[PDB]
RNA sequence: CGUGACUCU
RNA sequence: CGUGACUCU
């Protein structure tokens, strides 16, 4: 089964109370995210049974209320996710996770990210 | 499971002694097969764990045993799958399926092909 | 199987 | 999930 990337990074940095503290990632936190998520692969769980696959390239530093990217001018990720999928993020506070050619600028939240597990 | 596309083709043909007859197949038998394997996706067993996929998009009309390509000169399929696989074809008088872009002949013996399975 | 790509962000 | 691509032929 694929595990939310939510929970991967609870068990990373220690959290049990995720949902407790509405507080977000110290840099310390994010660095240590940073290299376990790096690298991985994860598929999109806001567009039915289009589960895309995504390779992890990066955590943003901005929390995805910030992280902007050039909408066609330049929008915030969690308006585009509440304005095209009319999804009020739960966790806007946590940062997004950069995907697919450093030059290209796509973002994803945590919360639509499920890490893929491979099948050799 | 993936299955056999030489059992693809004996169940589409209506033949059970597959083996008793090594005669060639009939242009009825050619074109009646070549409707029903073009189109699928199949995957490549003479590779070890590299079970890479092709889309079929064409029957040989000529058999392995004779059909060619531009080898870097020009080979013959059974050849090169004695010469780089090390693998005399149980069926070099059956044709290939040519897969992936017309332009640019690739073609796999029956043998090494099986029928890969969708999962909606 | 692994990788990279699109329907993205 | 679907598609198309490479390690092909």
Redesign the pocket.
Known sequence: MAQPVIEFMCEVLDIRNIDEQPKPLTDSQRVRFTKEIK?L?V??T??????????V?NVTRRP?SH??????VE?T?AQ??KQ??NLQLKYPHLP?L????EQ??????LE?CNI?????
Request: charged share 20%; net charge positive.
């Open positions: 690298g692969k598929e999109v806001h567009c039915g049974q289009m589960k895309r696959k995504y390779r390239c995805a992280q902007t990217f050039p909408l066609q929008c990720v585009y996710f095209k999928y997004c950069q995907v697919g050619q290209k600028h796509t973002y994803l939240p639509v893929v597990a491979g099948q050799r």
